[PDB]
Amino acid sequence: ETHINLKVSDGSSEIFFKIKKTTPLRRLMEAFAKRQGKEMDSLRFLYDGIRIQADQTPEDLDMEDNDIIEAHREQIGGSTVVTTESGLKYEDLTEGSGAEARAGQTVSVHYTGWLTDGQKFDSSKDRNDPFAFVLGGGMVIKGWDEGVQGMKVGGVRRLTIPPQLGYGARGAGGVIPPNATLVFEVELLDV
Numbered sequence: 001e002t003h004i005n006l007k008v009s010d011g012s013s014e015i016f017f018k019i020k021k022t023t024p025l026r027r028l029m030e031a032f033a034k035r036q037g038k039e040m041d042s043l044r045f046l047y048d049g050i051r052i053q054a055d056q057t058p059e060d061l062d063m064e065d066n067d068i069i070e071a072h073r074e075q076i077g078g079s080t081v082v083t084t085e086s087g088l089k090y091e092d093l094t095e096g097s098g099a100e101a102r103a104g105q106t107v108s109v110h111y112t113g114w115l116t117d118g119q120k121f122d123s124s125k126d127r128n129d130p131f132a133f134v135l136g137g138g139m140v141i142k143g144w145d146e147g148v149q150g151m152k153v154g155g156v157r158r159l160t161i162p163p164q165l166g167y168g169a170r171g172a173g174g175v176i177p178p179n180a181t182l183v184f185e186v187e188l189l190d191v
């Protein structure tokens with residue numbers, strides 16, 4: 001057996017790779033990152049709890065067919081996922097430096113939204129068009145009205161929105177199913 005199959009999971013997306021046992025894992029890591037639209041260095045890949053280095057081969061690490069590699073977002077400082085009393089979760093990926101978003105203000109953001117299996121359902125960046133809304137105004141889903149509060153301009157926050165703070169039992173747009181948890185990455189551009 002000259003080749004093996006490896007699964008990379010980021011906790012949402014699961015992608016399989018067929019690779020020669022003597023090929024550096026760089027190729028797999030770069031192929032995985034390419035798909036998620038990121039640079040290989042923005043991610044950490046773990047095998048058996050140990051970070052993979054790009055020059056290492058499957059043979060080097062004694063990997064077997066159908067072994068699993070976990071992909072985590074590089075977050076140097078270390079992050080904290082916050083869970084509020086409503087059940088909303090959020091994590092500041094980058095802290096802003098600018099003014100703070102407060103309820104009642106009109107704010108402008110870029111965003112991407114995904115389902116929990118990793119499927120992208122929308123992004124403002126796809127239309128190169130920042131999105132403005134009145135924070136706390138009931139014109140966006142509740143998880144946004146809560147979750148964007150306290151962001152500072154320049155900040156990137158990742159919201160994990162349970163369905164009662166999203167589209168509930170009815171879903172949305174022929175794409176978001178009933179009872180969907182939603183993941184958004186939101187960048188605050190202006191307040």
Ligand SMILES: COc1cc(CCCOC(=O)[C@@H]2CCCCN2S(=O)(=O)Cc2ccccc2)cc(OC)c1OC
Binds near residue numbers: 131138167173176
């Ligand atoms: C269909 O039901 C509703 C629709 C709206 C319209 C605004 C929808 O947009 C959003 O709230 C979120 C957050 C802010 C940016 C846009 N998103 S969004 O999820 O990406 C909208 C979307 C795009 C593509 C397919 C399905 C859904 C508001 C709602 O709440 C006031 C709704 O009730 C839960």
Ligand SMILES: [Ca+2]
Binds near residue numbers: 131
């Ligand atoms: Ca706009």
